[PDB]
Amino acid sequence: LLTDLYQATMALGYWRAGRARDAAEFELFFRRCPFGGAFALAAGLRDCVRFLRAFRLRDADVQFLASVLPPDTDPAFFEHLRALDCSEVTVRALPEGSLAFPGVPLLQVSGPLLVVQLLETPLLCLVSYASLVATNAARLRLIAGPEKRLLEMGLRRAQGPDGGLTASTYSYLGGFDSSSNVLAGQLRGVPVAGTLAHSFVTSFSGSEVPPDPMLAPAAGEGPGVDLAAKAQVWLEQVCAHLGLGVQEPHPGERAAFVAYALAFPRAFQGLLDTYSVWRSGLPNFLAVALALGELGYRAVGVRLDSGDLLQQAQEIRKVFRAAAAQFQVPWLESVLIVVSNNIDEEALARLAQEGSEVNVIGISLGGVYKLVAVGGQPRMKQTLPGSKAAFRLLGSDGSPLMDMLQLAEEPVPQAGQELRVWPPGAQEPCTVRPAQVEPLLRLCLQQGQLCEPLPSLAESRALAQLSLSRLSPEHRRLRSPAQYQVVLSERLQALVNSLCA
Amino acid sequence: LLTDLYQATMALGYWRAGRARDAAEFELFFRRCPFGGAFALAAGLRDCVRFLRAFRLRDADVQFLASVLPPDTDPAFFEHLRALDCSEVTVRALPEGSLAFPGVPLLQVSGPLLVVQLLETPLLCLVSYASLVATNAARLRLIAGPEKRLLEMGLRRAQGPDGGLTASTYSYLGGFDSSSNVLAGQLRGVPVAGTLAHSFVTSFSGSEVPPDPMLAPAAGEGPGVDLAAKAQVWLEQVCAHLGLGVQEPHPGERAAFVAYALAFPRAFQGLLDTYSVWRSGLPNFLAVALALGELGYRAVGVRLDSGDLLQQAQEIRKVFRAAAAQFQVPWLESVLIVVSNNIDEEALARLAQEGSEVNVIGISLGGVYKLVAVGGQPRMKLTLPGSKAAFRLLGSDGSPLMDMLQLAEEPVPQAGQELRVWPPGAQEPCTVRPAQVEPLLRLCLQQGQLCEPLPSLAESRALAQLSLSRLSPEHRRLRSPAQYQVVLSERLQALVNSLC
């Protein structure tokens, strides 16, 4: 994944001109207030580093490039492209989970010019996307607010060949509790749920079959029950309890329920929606819930996709008040009510509220990779020169005030106070006295060898939840938040003025 | 507070000699490998800070003093004493749950000599005891290894007043799952659990009382049924099933269970071993857990203290298995099994696990506070001088290699490379390139006012568990672990030499 012609013409541009092995620093930051949010939260590195570690250039990829390029280029030092990197590259990176504000770096990348140049395209791919998914998952968690396991990704279908993965991965980071996706489960141990599908239900006519209809008893012992037969018997009792034709529940629906039940009898879930909740789905669920519970036992949830979810949520639990008084079955009412589809926001907020009988709810940044210094001399042209250190200044209450950029040479922190040139009011400086002064970009990789082990998602995820909880109300506002200062050291501001502002 | 004479004595000393407002810095650190491990958990920041208001005044303590006994005494200037405030005091701290190694400060306290000296005593107690509790719970969570409902404190004595509260809080931080302490529940939100008691069971004759023996059906309205009657009906069936006389399982026990279960129908649990487990506790549990249940309630729990617990537990599940089938009652299989009365930590290792059947298990530092500077002018005795900064060299499997020490003036290190003279260790410098370099002590209080909000015990507890995972295997070692090296800057070593 060198993938585009300009990468290679620029590569050979630099090779031909003596600059391929020149020391360059680059920085990836962004500009857009993302979703009209104040922050991104930061994600990508996971994938970044797996990539750098399969710089994959087959001799047949390269032979091809020589086809498209001038004959005889250079002495056929295409060799360079086969020697790649190995690595003289260096990365500092915001930890995933960290909050990220416009016009502060998230990566800084350092190395041979020709190489670190190649990475513009892939690093954006990864970071921009990862961060957008996380950041949104964060805003949904903000709307829902934090209670049980409420919040369920997915149900819905890939970008691409395989990358369902990443949606899943970084929604977890943002705050969702589990996921339908099994790639993310296997790799990264996202919790996996989400079992139900309309396409199962509608594949059944009615015409049930006994290759084996018999459900083993929950306990142990030979003969169980012809589970199908019994559920009919329970269906009489329910329709009686409900004022219904026994003729009325769709027997397709019943078969599929039964069919699910034989395979997952400890985890029997019920999709209420396919035809009619009230006159089909629900009666059939109970018929079948209650046939279990003698033998294979204790059903486990139901699902809705349409209508006023909140009104059906609330009516569904309702009269179990007497729909389990009537049959005496302790557990029915504490069955889970899962809802999905047409949710987005408010329903979202009120289904996360009130007294709501729902338990589980299914479901641009301006990213920029810029050279800031080559040959340890700075480089400028609205984006700031030279190789920088970055630092979040926090208030007494825990919450960030402002990020501060300064030179790599400079001394560092502390918890006494600073002059400091804000980039609006850039006529004279503040003095500011921060409670804490935590640095931002940590060393991920030096000379191609990792300088840190990689967090679990659960670490990364906890850091996010932490960072958001500590972030100011005014900066967490979904629309029209307060601004957030980035601001400059004196010696930076002076380099900016040196390099004719 | 100030609790012994010589504290007040030596205060008066400083006053009298014009030294009471002299700017001192002190270092609290520890000397000893506790339980013979290599590390401690830093703990007890929560209490030092609440406390620095509860110092509080009172004047009648100052009046008892003053029979300090020089009557005599300075223009009645005990007013300083009633004036005292722990402002001008500035602290830096390891955060909670960070590992700590002997050699390296846990706090620095700076301020007026007379003031910051007086706090030697409070801070020594609070920090020593909290860190000793957390470290112990770490050592035991290591030995239990890490599962889901498992590990449990543990109360028959800790202290008297505050010590229930702290022992529990800091066991939760070292990574117990929960506590029996209600006081810790209430303030610091520590899960609360553990419920039964031999004495409750021994209190029943088996002349049982029906003021109400009606349990309620758990479905929804309708009359409640007499639970004791039904336990009895069901007793005949369990003893048949088990091959015992209906007579052997003890009546008063059964009373006590039924009594519990009337109070706790959804969370019924069973102490098995008051009398016999096999001939009594267990039959009586099964009799109730079935009667209860025939009303739609589920049993939750059983408990052993005594016996060979690893074994009783596997035999028990056999029969829970045999009865869930026989009686058609499947929850009975995953009824939990709680054990208690080891405290000893070889026992723990048997019990956790093995494919052990148990679910839940019920259940000093060389500490120093030393003056390093007065009048920005260092002090050394012949322990380590000057105001310092401290730093932990890592990595790149994340595991620490050494803590390093440093003048407070010096630049901060990063992830190139470093010349540093050890302790043995004034022969010749090491050279080291840290992967990462964490600075350990962080400002939590400046000039009376706190410069950061307190982490939560979820936050502290996860950092502890975290920090322990990254530790190399040689420091995690319970018996005979490797000595963690602590080491000096050139400039710090250069100050130590003068005079030796």
Residue numbers in the entry:
A (entry chain B): 16 to 378, 390 to 407, 415 to 534
B (entry chain A): 16 to 378, 390 to 408, 416 to 533
Wording from the paper:
Nicotinic acid phosphoribosyltransferase (EC 2.4.2.11) (NaPRTase) is the rate-limiting enzyme in the three-step Preiss–Handler pathway for the biosynthesis of NAD. The enzyme catalyzes the conversion of nicotinic acid (Na) and 5-phosphoribosyl-1-pyrophosphate (PRPP) to nicotinic acid mononucleotide (NaMN) and pyrophosphate (PPi). Our structural data allow the assignment of human NaPRTase to the type II phosphoribosyltransferase subfamily and reveal that the enzyme consists of two domains and functions as a dimer with the active site located at the interface of the monomers.
Here, we report the crystal structure of human NaPRTase that was solved by molecular replacement at a resolution of 2.9 Å in its ligand-free form. The crystal asymmetric unit contains a dimer of hNaPRTase and a total of 98 solvent molecules. Human NaPRTase monomer folds into 17 α-helices, 24 β-strands and the connecting loops organized in two domains: a first domain characterized by an irregular α/β barrel and a second open-faced sandwich domain. The irregular α/β barrel domain (residues 160–378) contains a six-stranded α/β core (β6, β7, β11, β12, β13, and α6, α11, α12, α13, α14) that identifies hNaPRTase as a member of the type II Phosphoribosyltransferases (PRTases) subfamily. The crystal structure of hNaPRTase reveals the presence of an intimately associated dimer in the asymmetric unit with 3000 Å2 of the surface area buried at the dimer interface. The two monomers are arranged head to tail with the N-terminal domain in one monomer contacting the α/β barrel in the other monomer. As already reported in the previously characterized NaPRTases, the active site consists of a pocket located at the dimer interface. In particular, in hNaPRTase it is delimited by the loops connecting α-helix 6 with β-strand 6 and α-helix 8 with β-strand 8 of α/β barrel domain of monomer A and completed by residues of β-strand 11 and α-helix 1 from monomer B. In hNaPRTase the corresponding region (β13 and β14) revealed a different orientation determined by a 10 residues deletion that shorten the preceding alpha helix (α14). The resulting structural arrangement sterically prevents the binding of FK866 to hNaPRTase due to severe clashes between the inhibitor and the protein region defining the tunnel.
